[PDB]
Amino acid sequence: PFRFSPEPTLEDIRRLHAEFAAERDWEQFHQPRNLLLALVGEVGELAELFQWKSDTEPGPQAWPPKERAALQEELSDVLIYLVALAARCHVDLPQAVISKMDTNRQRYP
Template identity: 35%
Template sequence: MKDPEPGRGLDVATLQRRLAEFAAARGWQQYHTPKNLVSALSVEASELVEIFQWLTPEQSARVMSDPETAHRVTDEVADVLAYLLQLCEVLGIDPLSALDAKIDRNERRFPAPEEP
């Protein structure tokens, strides 16, 4: 069931459930091993890189202004996120907690310079 307003009322658990249901309905769960999901994630990330590969920094900053390219970027970002969320589900990782903890570690590792 599609939400009438994209992005409204969505959360990670809901998206993970929808992805799991999608895979289950097609009998794909057996293929969703950590190794396979990481490989698929890498492929999708590479497809995203391919869009930007030969662009200048200025062109890459304007990539969303071209509707066709914006659609491709959005689709590839969605593919990357889908495989990442599925990997987290299979491994029992809470992606939001993992990211929150990583930001905490990075803040300690790379403290902001004090203002003069």
């Protein structure tokens, strides 16, 4: 029964990223719209994976090796830029998610 690993946490990821950016072009990574565009480009790359996928053909779990690899990568980079963006925005992403999930229960009855 599929589950995620217990770690890294969102916090752990936030620290891996903060370090990664700290030792690099920290100001390129500091600009919220930069992170947001990077996040957009990553969501786009993700869409390129799926764009010609019939909803009738083998789903992502049955994708061949090169495609699963690229998919894991793209999903990961979406996540990395989202936490970097959340962190830059001083948004406490894990808590805001509880808050938002509660909102979505009345949005989707």
